Design a protein around this nucleic acid. Sequence first.
RNA 1: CUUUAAUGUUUGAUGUUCUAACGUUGACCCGUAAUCCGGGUUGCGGACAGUGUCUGGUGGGUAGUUUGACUGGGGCGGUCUCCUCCUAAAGAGUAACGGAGGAGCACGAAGGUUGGCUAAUCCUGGUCGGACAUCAGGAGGUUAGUGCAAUGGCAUAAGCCAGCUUGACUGCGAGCGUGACGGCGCGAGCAGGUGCGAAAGCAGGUCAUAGUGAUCCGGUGGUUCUGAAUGGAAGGGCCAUC
RNA 2: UGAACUCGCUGUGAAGAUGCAGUGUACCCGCGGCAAGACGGAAAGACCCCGUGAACCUUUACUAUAGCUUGACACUGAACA
RNA 3: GUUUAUUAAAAACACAGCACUGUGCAAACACGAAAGUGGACGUAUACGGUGUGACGCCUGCCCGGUGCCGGGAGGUUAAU
RNA 4: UUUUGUAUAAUGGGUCAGCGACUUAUAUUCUGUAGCAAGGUUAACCGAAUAGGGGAGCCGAAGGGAAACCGAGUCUUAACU
Lengths: 75, 50, 64, 71
Amino acid sequence: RNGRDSEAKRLGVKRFGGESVLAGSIIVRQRGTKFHAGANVGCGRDHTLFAKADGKVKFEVKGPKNRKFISIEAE
Amino acid sequence: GIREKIKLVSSAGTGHFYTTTKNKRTKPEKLELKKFDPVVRQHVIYKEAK
Amino acid sequence: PKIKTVRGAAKRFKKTGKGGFKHKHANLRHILTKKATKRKRHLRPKAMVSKGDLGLVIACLPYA
Amino acid sequence: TAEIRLSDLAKVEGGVVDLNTLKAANIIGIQIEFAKVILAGEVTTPVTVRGLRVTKGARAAIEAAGGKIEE
RNA sequence: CUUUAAUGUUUGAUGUUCUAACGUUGACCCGUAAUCCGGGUUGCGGACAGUGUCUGGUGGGUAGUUUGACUGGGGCGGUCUCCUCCUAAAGAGUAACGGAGGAGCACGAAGGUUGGCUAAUCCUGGUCGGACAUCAGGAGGUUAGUGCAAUGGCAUAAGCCAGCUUGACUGCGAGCGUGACGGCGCGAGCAGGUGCGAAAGCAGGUCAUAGUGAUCCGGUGGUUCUGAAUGGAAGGGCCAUC
RNA sequence: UGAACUCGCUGUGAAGAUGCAGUGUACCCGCGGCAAGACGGAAAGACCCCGUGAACCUUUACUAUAGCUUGACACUGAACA
RNA sequence: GUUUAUUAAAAACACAGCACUGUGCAAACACGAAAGUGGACGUAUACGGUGUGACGCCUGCCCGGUGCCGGGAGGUUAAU
RNA sequence: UUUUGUAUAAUGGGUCAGCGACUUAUAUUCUGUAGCAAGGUUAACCGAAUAGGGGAGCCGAAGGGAAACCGAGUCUUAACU
C-alpha cells in the first residue's frame, strides 16, 4: 500500500555568503523561515528570499532568539 | 467540487466581466463587489450573473 | 518529389529575422477561472522556440 | 502587396514612378496590386511617385533629392 | 371572448362497393408436333399484394477491429497524477511490488488594512458541578494554536477578537529559481485607478508546500482586424470565458 | 562435417572441459562388438514469455451490414357512409 | 451400421421410437442481386427445424431473468 | 555473430569457384570548391541546337504584428523609466 512519493522541490540555499548577486536574485528557497530577510532583502509570499539591491550576500545572527538573517552589502 | 463558478458583469455599459466561484446554497445572495474596469479605467460595481 | 510541409506546424510557427520561431503558450484555452491573473498575463505574449525542439521544428517545415 | 526599395525606385523609367510599368520594370510582380515605398537609401536622382505610399524615410529622401509626392 | 347550430371549404383516419392499373405457379384458343414464353378471351383477386427511394426496430446470419503497462516468469492481486517525512550517504538530485501518511477541496470570508489581545497542562478556593464545563489567583512559557495529512516555520506573532473595506485590481515587469521540452514558481519597480491608516506604509488572495488535464473540435460575450466583384452579413482572427 | 597431431583425474571457467592449470597414464594402425560422452544427428521449441504480429471461434465488447419487420412517397384509381 | 484417408473405431455419430414447434401450398424453408429451381409433379396420417434416443416404470416444483406467443389504457418514439 | 560476459558444451559455416547487400530520382539544409555580386540564376520552349535566345519565375538585400496596418522600426498598452 506504500510506494507513493512527491517530486523534489529543490529547496535550499541558491547563493552563499560572500557572493555578489544582482537585484531580484533568489538567495534561499525554504518552506518556513530558515533565514529572515535583513537589509536590502525581501521575503516573498513563498518565504523565498530575494535581493532588493546589487551587492554581496552576507549571513549573520541577530535577535534574542539567535535567528539567522541574510543581508546584502553594497560593496 | 461542490462549489461552482460564476461570472461578475460590470454595471457599466462595457461588457467586461470577472469570474469566480461561490457556494449557492450557503450564500444565495448576489455579489456586488466593486472592481476595476479596464475598458473605462474606473472602479465600478460588478453584479453577479450566470 | 518536393518535401511536404507539415500543415499542423505551419499553423503554429512563423519564421523570424534570425531564423527562430515564435509560438503561443499552451495553457490559455480553457479552465481559466482557477488560473491566477499573473499566470494568464505572462502566457499571452508569444514566445521563442527552445533550442532543443528547434531541430524538430525546422525539420517539420523546411520551407519557412 | 509588396514593398519597393528606395534604391530601385529610380530604376523604373527615367525619373517618373507610377503603379503602371512597375510590372514592366519587374520589381514587384504581375499579381501585386498594392505597393509601398520603404527607406533603402542610396537615392540620388529626383523621382516622382504617383499612387504609391512613401511613409517618412523615402519621403524625406526624395524631397531632399528633389522629388515630389502626389496622389 | 366564454358558450352553439345549417349550407359551402381544406380535408384526413376508418368502413362498404366497383374496375380500368397491377397480380394470377386458374381455365380455353393461337404462334407451336412446345410442361417455357408472348398474345387473345374469360374467371378469380384488386388499389391491397408486390417493387423502388427514405426511415425506426431487430440483426454474431456475416464482416472489419479492439481487448494497456508496470511485474524479482506470466496470470491473479496491487499500482499508474499530485502533496509530507524517511530511505537520500550534513548543496541540489537520487531507485525498488522499500517504510509511513494525505489530496481531486474550502473561504466574499477564513482575503486586505488598522487597532488590540496572548496558549496547553497543573495546584488552591468556590451552588448544582462530579476526573474533566464556567469564575479568581498562582505555577508553567508554547508542551497550545494555526479550515484539511505531514514537514518546516510563526511573539513584530503567520495564533485570537473587532472596525472599515474588496489589492482575490488592469497593463507591464529588470533580475532569478526550476525542468529535455511543453511548462511551473519568485519578484522589487513603472503606469492607471482603489481600500485601510493621523502618518510612515501595507495590499497583484489565503503561514508555505497537494486541491489538477495539453491540443483539437465547439458554445457565450466584446472588438469594422479580416470578410474572396462591390456594400453588408455568414465564417474566421484577436480579447474574455465555458 | 569450422579445422584437428580428437586420453583419465581434480580444479578453474558464459557456472557439467578431448583442447585451460596441475598431475597421472599411454608403442604405431586395424577388425568384430557394446552405446556412457562428444550438452551426439534429424526439426530457426509445439511448452513459457514477448510482438501496440496473424488467423479462426464466442458473446448482453465496439462500429457496421445481408436478411426480417414498421411507416411515408411513387407505380395507385373511381363512387358512397 | 457410421467416423478422425496417414497415431484415437469409442461411452462418440446415426438409429427405429417419442415430444415440441413452423408450414393451408405461389407452403414454411433453402440455393439464387433476379428469373427460376429444390421442397414436390408432395400438400397436415404431408413437409422443415429442434431436442431426446428400442423397450419397461416414469418424466416432479418455479414464468422472476433471457427468448417466444397474445393483448392493449397510458408514456416514449424516425422519415414526412 | 550476439552479449555484462564466450575455448565455450551459445548461434553460423563440409570445402572450392562464381554471384550476393547503403543504390537511384526529385526536393530541402549544412560543409568544401568555382563563377558573379546587392545582386545571383533561369525552367518549359525556340534553336543546322552542350552555343545563343527566353528573366515567366525563384532566392536575397527589412522587419514587426493574428490582421488591417505600420516601417528601421514594430507589437504589446490608455501610455511605457
